[PDB]
Amino acid sequence: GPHMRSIGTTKLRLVEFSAFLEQQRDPDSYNKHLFVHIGHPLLESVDIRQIYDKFPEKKGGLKELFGKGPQNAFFLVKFWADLNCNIQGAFYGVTSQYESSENMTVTCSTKVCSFGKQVVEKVETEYARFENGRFVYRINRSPMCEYMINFIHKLKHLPEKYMMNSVLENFTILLVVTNRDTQETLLCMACVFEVSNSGAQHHIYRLV
Protein backbone atom coordinates (compact mmCIF):
# COMPACT_ATOMS: atom_id res chain seq x y z
CA GLY A 1 0.00 0.00 0.00
CA PRO A 2 2.58 2.58 -1.04
CA HIS A 3 2.00 6.27 -1.60
CA MET A 4 3.78 7.93 -4.51
CA ARG A 5 4.60 11.60 -3.96
CA SER A 6 7.19 14.33 -4.41
CA ILE A 7 10.16 14.50 -2.05
CA GLY A 8 9.66 18.16 -1.12
CA THR A 9 12.11 20.57 0.45
CA THR A 10 15.25 19.16 2.03
CA LYS A 11 18.32 20.78 3.61
CA LEU A 12 20.80 18.46 1.90
CA ARG A 13 20.68 16.68 -1.44
CA LEU A 14 22.67 13.66 -2.62
CA VAL A 15 23.99 14.56 -6.09
CA GLU A 16 26.38 11.69 -6.78
CA PHE A 17 27.60 8.42 -5.29
CA SER A 18 29.81 5.64 -6.56
CA ALA A 19 31.59 2.60 -5.13
CA PHE A 20 34.49 1.44 -7.24
CA LEU A 21 37.59 -0.68 -7.75
CA GLU A 22 40.50 1.16 -9.40
CA GLN A 23 43.40 -0.94 -10.67
CA GLN A 24 46.71 0.44 -11.89
CA ARG A 25 48.03 -1.41 -14.93
CA ASP A 26 51.16 0.82 -14.86
CA PRO A 27 52.15 4.30 -13.58
CA ASP A 28 50.10 6.08 -16.27
CA SER A 29 47.22 3.61 -16.86
CA TYR A 30 44.26 2.95 -14.57
CA ASN A 31 41.04 0.99 -14.93
CA LYS A 32 38.00 1.83 -12.80
CA HIS A 33 35.00 -0.47 -12.29
CA LEU A 34 31.81 0.82 -10.65
CA PHE A 35 29.96 -1.62 -8.38
CA VAL A 36 27.03 0.73 -7.67
CA HIS A 37 26.30 4.37 -8.38
CA ILE A 38 23.69 7.13 -8.11
CA GLY A 39 23.51 10.21 -10.32
CA HIS A 40 25.50 9.06 -13.39
CA PRO A 41 10.56 13.51 -9.00
CA LEU A 42 7.83 11.23 -7.61
CA LEU A 43 8.96 8.44 -5.28
CA GLU A 44 6.93 5.51 -4.06
CA SER A 45 6.92 4.71 -0.35
CA VAL A 46 7.95 1.68 1.69
CA ASP A 47 6.60 0.92 5.17
CA ILE A 48 9.70 1.26 7.35
CA ARG A 49 8.37 -1.47 9.63
CA GLN A 50 9.25 -3.94 6.85
CA ILE A 51 12.99 -3.23 7.26
CA TYR A 52 13.50 -2.77 11.02
CA ASP A 53 14.70 -6.36 11.46
CA LYS A 54 17.48 -5.72 8.88
CA PHE A 55 19.13 -2.87 10.83
CA PRO A 56 20.24 -2.24 14.43
CA GLU A 57 17.31 -1.25 16.64
CA LYS A 58 18.93 -0.38 19.97
CA LYS A 59 19.44 3.17 21.21
CA GLY A 60 20.45 5.26 18.22
CA GLY A 61 18.95 2.64 15.90
CA LEU A 62 16.88 3.10 12.77
CA LYS A 63 13.53 3.16 14.57
CA GLU A 64 14.73 5.78 17.06
CA LEU A 65 16.25 7.87 14.27
CA PHE A 66 13.08 7.73 12.17
CA GLY A 67 10.93 8.76 15.14
CA LYS A 68 13.12 11.86 15.69
CA GLY A 69 14.61 13.35 12.48
CA PRO A 70 12.41 14.76 9.74
CA GLN A 71 10.64 11.86 8.09
CA ASN A 72 11.11 13.26 4.61
CA ALA A 73 14.89 12.73 4.99
CA PHE A 74 14.57 8.89 5.11
CA PHE A 75 14.87 6.66 2.02
CA LEU A 76 15.23 3.01 1.09
CA VAL A 77 17.64 2.40 -1.79
CA LYS A 78 17.62 -0.94 -3.61
CA PHE A 79 20.86 -1.51 -5.53
CA TRP A 80 21.59 -4.03 -8.27
CA ALA A 81 25.37 -4.32 -8.11
CA ASP A 82 27.77 -4.92 -11.00
CA LEU A 83 30.25 -7.65 -10.05
CA ASN A 84 31.56 -8.22 -13.58
CA CYS A 85 35.20 -7.20 -13.19
CA ASN A 86 38.50 -9.13 -13.31
CA ILE A 87 40.10 -8.48 -9.90
CA GLN A 88 43.89 -8.34 -10.24
CA GLY A 89 47.79 -1.76 -6.98
CA ALA A 90 44.06 -2.05 -6.38
CA PHE A 91 42.16 0.70 -4.56
CA TYR A 92 38.62 0.00 -3.32
CA GLY A 93 36.90 3.35 -2.85
CA VAL A 94 33.76 5.44 -2.58
CA THR A 95 32.97 8.93 -3.83
CA SER A 96 29.96 11.02 -2.98
CA GLN A 97 28.77 14.57 -3.42
CA TYR A 98 26.13 16.41 -1.39
CA GLU A 99 24.85 19.95 -1.84
CA SER A 100 23.05 22.42 0.39
CA SER A 101 22.05 26.06 0.49
CA GLU A 102 23.33 26.22 4.11
CA ASN A 103 26.94 26.14 5.29
CA MET A 104 27.04 23.14 7.64
CA THR A 105 29.54 20.72 9.10
CA VAL A 106 28.28 17.32 8.02
CA THR A 107 29.07 13.92 9.52
CA CYS A 108 28.49 10.87 7.29
CA SER A 109 28.09 7.57 9.11
CA THR A 110 28.04 4.35 7.12
CA LYS A 111 27.07 1.22 9.05
CA VAL A 112 27.57 -2.21 7.52
CA CYS A 113 25.05 -4.68 8.92
CA SER A 114 24.99 -8.47 8.73
CA PHE A 115 21.86 -10.30 9.89
CA GLY A 116 20.74 -6.95 11.30
CA LYS A 117 23.87 -6.51 13.44
CA GLN A 118 26.39 -3.72 12.96
CA VAL A 119 29.74 -5.18 11.89
CA VAL A 120 31.58 -1.99 10.78
CA GLU A 121 30.90 1.73 11.01
CA LYS A 122 32.74 4.34 8.95
CA VAL A 123 32.48 7.95 10.13
CA GLU A 124 33.66 10.93 8.05
CA THR A 125 33.25 14.63 8.83
CA GLU A 126 33.07 17.09 5.94
CA TYR A 127 33.22 20.89 5.86
CA ALA A 128 31.45 22.86 3.15
CA ARG A 129 33.05 24.48 0.10
CA PHE A 130 31.27 27.40 -1.53
CA GLU A 131 30.94 26.65 -5.25
CA ASN A 132 28.89 28.79 -7.68
CA GLY A 133 26.24 29.95 -5.26
CA ARG A 134 25.77 26.87 -3.08
CA PHE A 135 27.65 24.67 -0.62
CA VAL A 136 29.18 21.42 -1.89
CA TYR A 137 30.34 18.46 0.23
CA ARG A 138 32.56 16.13 -1.81
CA ILE A 139 34.00 12.84 -0.55
CA ASN A 140 36.74 11.88 -2.97
CA ARG A 141 38.41 8.46 -2.86
CA SER A 142 37.23 7.35 0.57
CA PRO A 143 38.70 3.85 1.09
CA MET A 144 36.42 0.85 1.62
CA CYS A 145 36.62 -1.00 4.90
CA GLU A 146 38.40 -4.36 4.89
CA TYR A 147 35.06 -6.05 5.56
CA MET A 148 33.62 -4.88 2.22
CA ILE A 149 36.74 -5.84 0.28
CA ASN A 150 36.61 -9.36 1.69
CA PHE A 151 32.84 -9.53 1.20
CA ILE A 152 33.10 -8.55 -2.48
CA HIS A 153 35.77 -11.22 -3.00
CA LYS A 154 33.61 -13.92 -1.39
CA LEU A 155 30.51 -13.02 -3.42
CA LYS A 156 32.51 -13.04 -6.66
CA HIS A 157 33.66 -16.58 -5.94
CA LEU A 158 30.06 -17.86 -6.18
CA PRO A 159 29.20 -19.43 -9.57
CA GLU A 160 25.62 -18.11 -9.96
CA LYS A 161 24.05 -14.70 -9.39
CA TYR A 162 21.11 -16.29 -7.57
CA MET A 163 23.55 -17.62 -4.98
CA MET A 164 24.99 -14.14 -4.50
CA ASN A 165 21.46 -12.78 -4.09
CA SER A 166 20.72 -15.32 -1.32
CA VAL A 167 23.85 -14.19 0.55
CA LEU A 168 22.92 -10.54 0.01
CA GLU A 169 19.51 -11.08 1.67
CA ASN A 170 21.20 -10.57 5.05
CA PHE A 171 23.58 -7.72 4.07
CA THR A 172 22.52 -4.10 4.41
CA ILE A 173 24.05 -0.63 4.63
CA LEU A 174 22.72 2.27 6.72
CA LEU A 175 23.94 5.75 5.72
CA VAL A 176 23.08 8.60 8.10
CA VAL A 177 24.22 12.15 7.31
CA THR A 178 23.93 14.51 10.28
CA ASN A 179 24.55 18.19 10.93
CA ARG A 180 27.53 17.84 13.25
CA ASP A 181 26.74 20.96 15.31
CA THR A 182 22.97 20.44 15.74
CA GLN A 183 22.70 16.62 15.44
CA GLU A 184 19.83 17.03 12.95
CA THR A 185 19.40 14.11 10.53
CA LEU A 186 19.97 15.53 7.05
CA LEU A 187 19.63 12.30 5.06
CA CYS A 188 19.20 8.65 5.95
CA MET A 189 19.47 5.90 3.34
CA ALA A 190 18.71 2.29 4.24
CA CYS A 191 20.32 0.24 1.49
CA VAL A 192 19.56 -3.29 0.29
CA PHE A 193 21.30 -5.22 -2.45
CA GLU A 194 21.04 -7.75 -5.26
CA VAL A 195 23.37 -8.44 -8.18
CA SER A 196 22.49 -6.88 -11.52
CA ASN A 197 21.78 -9.17 -14.44
CA SER A 198 21.42 -6.21 -16.83
CA GLY A 199 25.67 -2.45 -15.54
CA ALA A 200 24.43 -1.37 -12.11
CA GLN A 201 20.92 -0.16 -11.28
CA HIS A 202 19.07 1.33 -8.33
CA HIS A 203 15.57 2.31 -7.21
CA ILE A 204 14.85 4.86 -4.47
CA TYR A 205 11.81 4.81 -2.16
CA ARG A 206 10.60 7.06 0.62
CA LEU A 207 10.46 5.44 4.06
CA VAL A 208 7.14 6.02 5.87
Q: By CB under 6 A, how many residues form the interface with ligand Y2D?
A: 23
Q: Which residue is nearest to ligand Y2D (CB)?
A: 145
Q: Which of 12, 73, 104, 148 binds ligand Y2D (CB under 6 A)?
A: 148
- 98 near ligand Y2D (CB under 6 A): no
Bridge partners (DSSP) listed for residue 37:
18
For residue 28, the minimal CB distance to ligand Y2D (Å) is 27
Span near ligand Y2D by CB under 6 A; candidates 24-32, 66-74, 128-136, 149-157: 149-157
Q: Which of 113, 155, 174, 186 binds ligand Y2D (CB under 6 A)?
A: 155
3-state secondary structure 69-85: CCHHHEEEEEEEECCCC
- 135 near ligand Y2D (CB under 6 A): no
Bridge partners (DSSP) listed for residue 178:
107, 185
Question: Within 10 A of 200 (CB to CB), how many other CB atoms are there?
Answer: 21
Map residues 115-134 to x or -, x wherever contact with ligand Y2D holds by CB under 6 A.
-----x-x------------
- 96 near ligand Y2D (CB under 6 A): yes
Distance between CA atoms of 117 and 185, rounded to whole angstroms? 21
Distances (CA, A) of 169 to 3, 80, 107, 111, 179: 25, 12, 28, 16, 31
| Residue spans of beta strands (DSSP E) within 105-196 | 105-114, 117-127, 129-131, 134-143, 171-179, 185-195
Residues 6+ apart with CB under 8 A from 152: 21, 35, 83, 92
Nearer CB in complex with ligand Y2D: 96/135: 96
Nearer CB in complex with ligand Y2D: 29/197: 197
Distance between CA atoms of 175 and 191, rounded to whole angstroms? 8
Nearer CB in complex with ligand Y2D: 3/169: 169
For residue 72, the minimal CB distance to ligand Y2D (Å) is 17
Which residues bind to ligand Y2D, rule: CB under 6 A? 17, 19, 35-36, 81, 83, 94, 96, 110, 112, 120, 122, 144-145, 148, 151-152, 155, 173, 175, 189, 191, 193
